[PDB]
Write an enzyme that holds these catalytic residues in place. Structure first.
Site, mmCIF file in Angstrom:
data_model
loop_
_atom_site.group_PDB
_atom_site.id
_atom_site.type_symbol
_atom_site.label_atom_id
_atom_site.label_comp_id
_atom_site.label_asym_id
_atom_site.label_seq_id
_atom_site.Cartn_x
_atom_site.Cartn_y
_atom_site.Cartn_z
ATOM 1 N N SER A 174 -0.296 5.292 -4.873
ATOM 2 C CA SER A 174 -0.045 4.084 -5.842
ATOM 3 C C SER A 174 0.430 4.974 -7.188
ATOM 4 O O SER A 174 1.291 5.494 -7.181
ATOM 5 C CB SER A 174 -1.330 3.428 -6.106
ATOM 6 O OG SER A 174 -1.199 1.966 -6.797
ATOM 7 N N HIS A 232 0.071 -3.035 1.026
ATOM 8 C CA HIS A 232 -0.177 -1.947 0.080
ATOM 9 C C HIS A 232 -1.273 -0.952 0.773
ATOM 10 O O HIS A 232 -1.437 0.499 0.274
ATOM 11 C CB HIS A 232 -0.602 -2.024 -1.222
ATOM 12 C CG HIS A 232 -0.385 -0.935 -2.585
ATOM 13 N ND1 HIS A 232 -1.343 -0.452 -3.255
ATOM 14 C CD2 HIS A 232 0.390 -0.166 -2.590
ATOM 15 C CE1 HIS A 232 -0.858 0.307 -4.059
ATOM 16 N NE2 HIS A 232 0.411 0.678 -3.728
ATOM 17 N N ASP A 251 5.834 -4.300 0.620
ATOM 18 C CA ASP A 251 4.736 -3.709 -0.502
ATOM 19 C C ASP A 251 5.439 -3.984 -1.717
ATOM 20 O O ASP A 251 6.569 -3.878 -2.055
ATOM 21 C CB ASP A 251 4.704 -2.225 -0.289
ATOM 22 C CG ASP A 251 3.590 -1.722 -1.019
ATOM 23 O OD1 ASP A 251 2.888 -2.481 -1.930
ATOM 24 O OD2 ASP A 251 3.193 -0.509 -1.216
#
Ligand SMILES: Nc1ncnc2c1ncn2[C@@H]1O[C@H](COP(=O)(O)O)[C@@H](O)[C@H]1O[C@@H]1O[C@H](COP(=O)(O)O)[C@@H](O)[C@H]1O
Lengths: 522, 423, 616
Positions: free
Chosen positions: C123, C317, C187
């Site tokens: 991330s 994710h 994603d």
């Protein structure tokens, strides 16, 4: 051209928020019945409503006397002409007064309308953009299903002014209003033809006319399609959430062919029908130009370097004339034309003229970038060329002149390239007035010698024994202004050494005028 | 004085003693021309040819040989004496001492019995010695007079039974030809040169009516006479040159039939003429023409459309016609054309499409020409041997290089040099 | 295998990177892990709104410009434009590299031991890893590429970080090969920052709460998720359409008129992107093709698909553990190097139209390579090089034998040689201005401005020919028309050449040319403060050795009391200029030189203590 871009342009336009915001403003204006102005996220939208009943079909010339004037458009013949009812409505609703107060302090403005409101909106935008001073804000215009506004001369004038890319006309393929005008009416700007499957952009007036013809001959008349633009806008603006593939047979292997087939399919026509082929030919004919302007513009530097030696030869001839014992200055040396070096420098002059004529023609035909004339290099190269060469063209005109039936250089005999270069000089930041310690290497006013020729004719005519005393007073009021202007140029050191040569025509004229004033008692 | 003579003139005479009579005479003739000025090759060549009865190549050889002996200077040129090129635009120069020696040699002895009558320098009127002894005829074959403005009363009678060439140099705007020409029974070449800055006007031009035996005529910086239908034809003229001349409306007369006047003219030169706008259409009526030169004429825009009549034409020079825009389509019918020169024709863009009919063509020159393409017919020109073009135009001659074997295609190197400014 | 042959990493390293990324959730701001010959630095991710958009930034996308002193390579050399990055990520990195943390000492220890260093994160930890890799390159790798070994950067579903100049600079330095980015097909985090702040301000916090792998007590209201997805994809479509229209040069005038009215995201991909599905792994190197793919791989194909995609984009994710565990089974393709791409993009969910636009993105790079080959062919010709050779070997020695120099000869003389030199000056200006014109429009590869042969040729051309252009400018009194040469007269080609050479010479030692010049000026001891000197030496000719004549022309003819400081600065720089060959010492001290004739009229007090007293 290996890449079709007619569908991509429409996708770019449709994906912006201006599309939906302008439609919202138009819908509100229709609902109210009056002009609406407001801001959305920093952009002002000026929506103009649709007036139910007005008579369309009568063309008239643009105003030239009233308070509404279009100085930026061509005033030559044939004359640009507009629809009489639209001008009448614009004058009636007093849009000028409202806009001159409501738009103060704004930065971005979009003028929009639906149908007759669209025609009025385009007229307003054209007025805003057609002044001598560019507006303090930016302007864009979007119309929905609007009828045509003017004739071919107006379209050509707008295109030559580089203003056609501020307009975008959204037209449904089933709407008859935009394609129901008499043949004297022509389109201008960019047209976005839309259906239930996507949109296509066409930018050429001839192509838009051809598409109008195809749709007229190959469509059914449904008169209620003028009320479906909200549905079309919603569908097109939400199309981005789903993947759209080719639904026909197998896509062509060539990339350009695949693009053309996809664009034909974006309007709902099967590629194997009779109208599909006509649409395909229309699109292919629209998209035809060659030799990418970026690469062409990069190449042009080599051609300029090829032609530069002629300019160097003019420089060397000027230098040799400056040191001669006759002391005429190179303008009078060229005009006399009694030596062999004059013929050779004539060769160089003709070569330079050909090169710059070709460059200007290329600019006017969109073979170079749309912002080509804003480059510093080309502005200064054209300035150098003109400063050196225009006096020799003046000398050529006054050498090859029939003395009786020969007019004057500045009275309609100046070449076009010099006017275009004078226009280009208005770019580039203005220079601070430096302090000059010497005469300029060239005379900074490139039309000085033509003006001297006219003043010489005036002085001779006043001098003539048959000169009428009223003629004489008028001629003196023509003669003293030039004397003052030349004196100011000389005291500022804005002229070169040749203007001050002992036996140049300027010195002779100056002595003659001093004698004339002494004799006449002035 | 004596020392300068004995120290320079005697040495030069000893050097000249090796020359054979023709070369010695060519050396001596050079003393008829002003000092420090260039002499075009055509004037000297025509004088020698009409004096010793040679051909052009032989006289060119004489001049070059004279150059090799350091008695004479050639002027630099990129095409000096190449094949088929002209002689009126290349020059020679002579050092002052050599000219002095020549002048002393030619001016020895009594005036009447001299071979050459020459005036060493510019003077207001003719030398008094000539008039003092005018009671007797003169046996000279060369007369050269260098004066200023002359008037009808400035001339006196002179008998010249043996004169073969007459050279006149003056610098003014008006001039009257001497009246004794009409009694020159053996005059074969006439040279009239004006050095002034504006064209001169020649008066009493009617003497040319009786010049039946002329074979060459050179005019420079003068007003060409207004030819009329009542002119007396020149039945023996073979060469005619007009250099830096003003034409006015002399050749523009519609009732003019030029072919009648010149029944046997074979060579024509018109050079550096600014007011020439077109050629008279009757020039095509001269069937004896072998070569035409129209050069440095910047305002001529087209050629007459009756060119196919000139069947004897072999050479065609047109270089430096800055505004000529095309060649007439009739050129493809000429059955003897050999050489075309269109260099420095910056307004010419394409050749006639049937240029492959002229099978006798051997050489072409397109230096600094604005050609955008050449026709596919030139593959048929079997006799072509030499081509000259710009370095950027070589790709257009690959087809001919392949088809016609033995063809040499030369790319001319762009030339610097500041000599053109020395006017 | 092909994966390692392409990227330079193997499955064991990827597994260790993912493991370290997982561990990084607990530690504070970063975690270090040591394993044999490899050291891994993993950065902690964050899930607050202020960690993506800085609250004190007033712009619409949260960007900021980099500091030219800290990141001297992240710019355009000839143009001189610096790159921009996300402000929140940069602040996070600045907090980590603060001496109070011990990160720098650990990095130095790892460097001393000659191990392989790796930066990684999941991330926004991935974005911090990218910026840390750039920081390491600038601070260590460019100084000594032997003592300091190559790095690796591995990210898992990271958002975009920099703009297009960022990517261009990475390409020019040949550093793009160190970066690898893993992205799942659906994603959403890689797509988020292509949207305007005002589009996602209302819904961003709730989606960030949903995305946090630790939070599981928040509601997943479908309405907010669908709204967030729709707005992000709308802005993405706008950006992608404009970008593809721009790169092909399609509708320049209409695009400019419309550009006045729009606000579009400046962020672009950087490095190699690897797209993963349940059957394939696809690697891509071209930034623009990756942008088009980021838009087109996320579209729906039925009405049934559209009912599952907004939630799938959040669920994907958290699917990189499975990707790492199953990497070895899938197929591998490299998109840029495959003849036919139709089948691969079919399996990735790209339609015919998106396939057209991805094809265009690749074709543009092929065109750039062909342009470069044409340029090299032109500049390797002997006829081209003979002009520089002639100026070097004929004109200069002849003008030296005249005892006045070739600058003065070109300035005042009318001979045949001067005319020839003028013709050749114009001919060379044509070639170099054509190359400049191609460069300014991005028609050449990113690596052109770093190529050593081009730098050498351009330096030779500048040093040889710029003095003649200054002479040409002053011979025609152009300085009395538009002012001094150094302000408005200098052509852009010479500036580009000078900047390219300066960067090439100076980058190994860290400092930039302006600070070098200012330190050298401070070292002369003129007795003045920095601001006064900076004002006195504005638009001066003492920055470049090839503008010596412009400076001399400007100072000539003025009284000494007014130009003391500029005279002293020029005399100070002259000796070093002569040593490096920027100025020819066989030219400027001649008897008929302009410089000598001016210098011998200065007051004798100045001339007594001048460094060059013995030369003249
Ligand atoms: N005042 C002026 N006049 C003419 N040309 C000028 C002037 N200032 C600058 N320039 C030239 O313009 C171009 C600009 O190029 P970029 O857009 O910056 O790439 C550049 O060539 C400038 O050059 C200097 O001007 C002289 C022009 O000489 P030329 O016409 O013979 O080429 C050059 O010698 C150089 O000193």
């Amino acid at each position: 051209c290996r890449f079709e871009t007619s569908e991509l342009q429409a996708s770019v336009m449709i994906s912006t928020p201006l599309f939906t915001d302008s439609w919202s403003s138009c819908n509100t204006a229709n609902c109210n019945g009056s002009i609406k102005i407001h801001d959305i996220a920093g952009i002002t939208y000026v929506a103009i409503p649709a007036v139910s009943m007005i008579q369309l079909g009568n063309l008239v010339g643009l105003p030239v006397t009233g308070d509404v004037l279009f100085p930026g458009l061509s005033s030559d013949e044939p004359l640009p002409m507009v629809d009489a009812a639209i001008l009448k409505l614009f004058l009636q609703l007093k849009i000028k007064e409202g806009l001159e107060l409501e738009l103060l302090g704004k930065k971005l403005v979009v003028i929009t309308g639906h149908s007759t409101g669209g025609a009025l909106a385009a007229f307003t935008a054209l007025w805003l953009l057609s002044q001598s001073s560019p507006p303090s804000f930016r302007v864009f215009c979007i119309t929905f299903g609007s009828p045509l506004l003017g004739n071919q001369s107006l379209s050509t004038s707008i295109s030559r002014s580089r203003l056609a890319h501020n307009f975008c006309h959204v037209v449904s393929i089933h709407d008859l209003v935009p394609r129901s005008s008499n043949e004297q009416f022509w389109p201008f700007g960019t047209y976005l033809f839309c259906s239930d499957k996507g949109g296509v952009c066409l930018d050429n007036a001839g192509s838009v006319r051809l598409m109008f013809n195809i749709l007229n001959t190959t469509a059914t008349q449904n008169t209620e399609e003028h009320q479906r633009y909200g549905h079309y806008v919603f569908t097109l603006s939400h199309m981005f959430l789903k993947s759209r593939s080719f639904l026909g047979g197998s896509i062509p292997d060539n990339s350009y062919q695949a693009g053309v087939a996809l664009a034909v399919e974006a309007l709902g026509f099967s590629n194997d029908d009779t109208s599909g082929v006509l649409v395909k030919e229309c699109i292919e004919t629209a998209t035809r130009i060659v030799r990418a302007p970026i690469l062409r513009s990069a190449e042009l530097a080599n051609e300029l370097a090829s032609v530069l030696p002629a300019r160097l030869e003019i420089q060397w001839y000027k230098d040799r004339c400056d040191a001669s014992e006759e002391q005429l200055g190179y303008y009078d040396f060229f005009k006399r034309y009694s030596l062999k070096r004059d013929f050779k420098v004539n060769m160089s002059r003709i070569r330079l003229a050909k090169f710059w004529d070709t460059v200007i023609k290329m600019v006017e035909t969109n073979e170079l970038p749309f912002d080509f004339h804003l480059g510093k290099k080309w502005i200064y190269a054209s300035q150098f060329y003109q400063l050196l060469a225009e006096p020799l063209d003046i000398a050529n005109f006054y050498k090859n002149r029939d003395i009786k039936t020969g007019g004057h250089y500045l009275e309609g005999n100046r070449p076009k390239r010099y006017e275009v270069i004078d226009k280009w000089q208005k770019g580039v930041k203005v220079p601070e007035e430096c302090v000059r310690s010497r005469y300029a290497s060239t005379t900074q006013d490139t039309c000085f010698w033509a003006k001297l020729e006219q003043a010489k004719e005036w002085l001779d005519e006043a001098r003539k024994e048959s000169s009428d005393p009223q003629r004489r007073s008028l001629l003196r009021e023509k003669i003293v202004p030039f004397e003052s202007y030349a004196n100011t140029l000389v005291t500022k050191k804005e002229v070169s050494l040749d203007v001050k040569a002992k036996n140049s025509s300027y010195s002779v004229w100056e002595a003659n005028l001093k004698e004339f004033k002494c004799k006449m008692g002035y | 004085d004596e020392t300068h003579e004995s120290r320079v003139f005697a040495q030069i005479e000893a050097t000249l003693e090796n020359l054979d009579p023709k070369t010695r005479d060519c050396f001596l003739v050079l003393g008829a021309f002003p000092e420090d000025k260039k002499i075009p090759l055509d004037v000297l060549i025509n004088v020698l040819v009409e004096l010793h009865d040679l051909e052009d190549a032989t006289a060119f050889a004489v001049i070059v040989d004279l150059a090799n002996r350091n008695l004479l200077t050639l002027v630099k040129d990129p095409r000096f004496g190449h094949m088929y090129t002209s002689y009126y635009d290349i020059f020679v120069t002579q050092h002052d001492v050599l000219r002095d020696v020549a002048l002393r040699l030619s001016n020895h002895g009594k005036v009447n019995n001299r071979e050459r009558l020459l005036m060493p320098k510019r003077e207001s009127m003719l030398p008094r010695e000539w008039e003092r002894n005018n009671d007797e005829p003169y046996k000279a074959r060369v007369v050269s007079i260098h004066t200023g403005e002359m008037t009808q009363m400035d001339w006196f009678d002179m008998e010249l039974p043996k004169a073969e060439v007459l050279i006149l140099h003056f610098s003014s705007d008006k001039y009257v030809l001497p009246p004794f020409i009409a009694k020159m029974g053996k005059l074969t070449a006439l040279v009239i040169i004006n050095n002034g800055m504006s064209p001169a006007r020649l008066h009493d031009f009617s003497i040319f009516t009786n010049l039946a035996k002329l074979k060459s005529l050179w005019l420079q910086r003068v007003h060409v006479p207004e030819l009329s239908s009542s002119t007396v034809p020149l039945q023996n003229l073979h060469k005619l040159s007009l250099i830096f001349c003003k034409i006015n409306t002399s050749l523009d007369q519609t009732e003019l039939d030029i072919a009648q006047i010149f029944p046997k003219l074979s060579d024509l030169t018109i050079d550096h003429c600014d007011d020439l706008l077109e050629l008279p259409s009757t020039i095509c009526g001269i069937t004896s023409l072998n070569s035409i030169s129209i050069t440095n004429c910047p305002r001529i825009k087209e050629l007459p459309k009756n060119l196919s009549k000139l069947k004897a034409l072999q050479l065609l020079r047109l270089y430096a016609c800055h505004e000529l825009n095309s060649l007439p389509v009739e050129i493809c019918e000429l059955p003897r054309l050999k050489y075309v020169d269109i260099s420095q024709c910056v307004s010419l863009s394409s050749l006639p499409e049937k240029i492959g009919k002229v099978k006798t063509l051997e050489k072409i020159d397109t230096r600094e020409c604005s050609l955008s393409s050449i026709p596919n017919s030139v593959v048929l020109l079997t006799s072509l041997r030499h081509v000259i073009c710009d370095r950027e135009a070589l790709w257009m001659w690959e087809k001919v290089q392949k088809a016609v074997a033995g063809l040499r295609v030369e790319a001319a190197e762009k030339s610097f040099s500041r000599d053109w400014l020395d006017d | 295998m092909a994966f390692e042959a392409l990227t330079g990493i193997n499955g064991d390293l990827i597994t260790r990177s993912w493991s370290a990324s997982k561990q990084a959730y607990l530690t504070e701001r970063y975690h270090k892990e040591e394993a044999g010959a490899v050291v891994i630095f993993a950065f902690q991710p964050s899930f607050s709104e202020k960690d993506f958009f800085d609250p004190d930034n007033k712009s619409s996308f949260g960007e900021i410009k980099l500091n030219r002193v800290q990141f001297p390579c992240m710019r355009k050399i000839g143009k001189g434009d610096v790159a921009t990055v996300n402000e929140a990520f940069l602040k996070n990195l600045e907090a980590i590299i603060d001496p109070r943390t011990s990160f720098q000492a650990s990095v130095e220890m790892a460097v001393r031991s000659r191990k392989q260093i790796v930066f990684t994160g999941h991330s926004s930890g991935g974005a911090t890893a990218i910026l840390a890799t750039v920081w390491y390159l600038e601070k260590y790798f460019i100084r000594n590429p032997n003592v300091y070994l190559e790095p690796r950067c591995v990210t898992f579903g990271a958002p975009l970080v920099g703009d297009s100049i960022f990517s261009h600079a990475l390409g020019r330095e040949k550093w793009s090969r160190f970066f690898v980015n893993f992205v799942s097909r659906f994603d959403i985090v890689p797509r988020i920052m292509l949207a305007r702040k005002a589009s996602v301000e209302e819904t961003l916090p709730h989606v960030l709460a949903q995305l946090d792998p630790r939070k599981s007590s928040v509601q997943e209201s479908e309405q907010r998720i669908t709204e967030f997805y729709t707005r992000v994809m709308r802005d993405t479509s706008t950006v992608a359409n404009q970008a593809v229209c721009e790169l092909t040069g399609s509708a320049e005038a209409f695009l400019e008129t419309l550009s006045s009215f729009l606000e579009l995201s400046p962020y672009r991909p950087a490095g190699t992107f690897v797209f993963s599905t349940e059957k394939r792994l696809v690697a891509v190197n071209n930034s623009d093709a990756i942008l088009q793919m980021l838009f087109y791989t996320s579209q729906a194909s039925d009405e049934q698909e559209w009912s599952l995609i907004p939630f799938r984009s959040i669920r994907d994710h958290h699917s990189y553990e499975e990707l790492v565990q199953s990497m070895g089974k899938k197929l591998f393709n490299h998109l840029d190097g495959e003849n036919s791409i139709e089948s691969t993009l079919n399996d990735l969910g790209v339609s015919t139209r998106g396939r057209q636009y991805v094809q265009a993105a690749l074709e543009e790079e092929k065109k750039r390579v062909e342009n470069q080959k044409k340029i090299i062919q032109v500049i390797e010709q002997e006829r081209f090089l003979k002009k520089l050779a002639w100026i070097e070997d004929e004109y200069k020695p002849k003008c030296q034998a005249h005892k006045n120099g070739y600058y003065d000869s070109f300035k005042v003389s009318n001979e045949e040689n001067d005319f020839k030199a003028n013709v050749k000056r114009a001919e060379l200006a044509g070639v170099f201005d054509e190359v400049l014109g191609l460069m300014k429009k991005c028609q050449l590869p990113d690596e052109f401005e770093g190529d050593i042969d081009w730098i050498k040729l351009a330096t030779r051309y500048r040093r040889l020919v710029e003095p003649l252009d200054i002479a040409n400018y002053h011979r025609h009194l152009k300085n009395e028309d538009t002012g001094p040469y150094m302000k408005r007269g200098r052509p852009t080609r010479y500036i580009y050449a000078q900047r390219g050479y300066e960067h090439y010479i100076l980058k190994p030692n860290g400092m930039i040319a302006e600070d070098v010049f200012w330190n050298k000026v401070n070292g002369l001891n003129l007795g003045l403060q920095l601001e006064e000197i900076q004002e006195t030496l504005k638009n001066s000719g003492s920055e470049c050795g090839s503008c010596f004549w412009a400076e001399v022309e400007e100072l000539k003819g003025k009284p000494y009391e007014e130009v003391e400081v500029r005279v002293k600065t020029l005399e100070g720089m002259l000796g070093e200029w002569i040593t490096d060959g920027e100025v020819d010492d066989k030219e400027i001290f001649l008897e008929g030189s302009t410089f000598r004739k001016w210098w011998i009229t200065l007051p004798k007090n100045h001339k007594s203590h001048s460094p060059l007293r013995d030369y003249m």
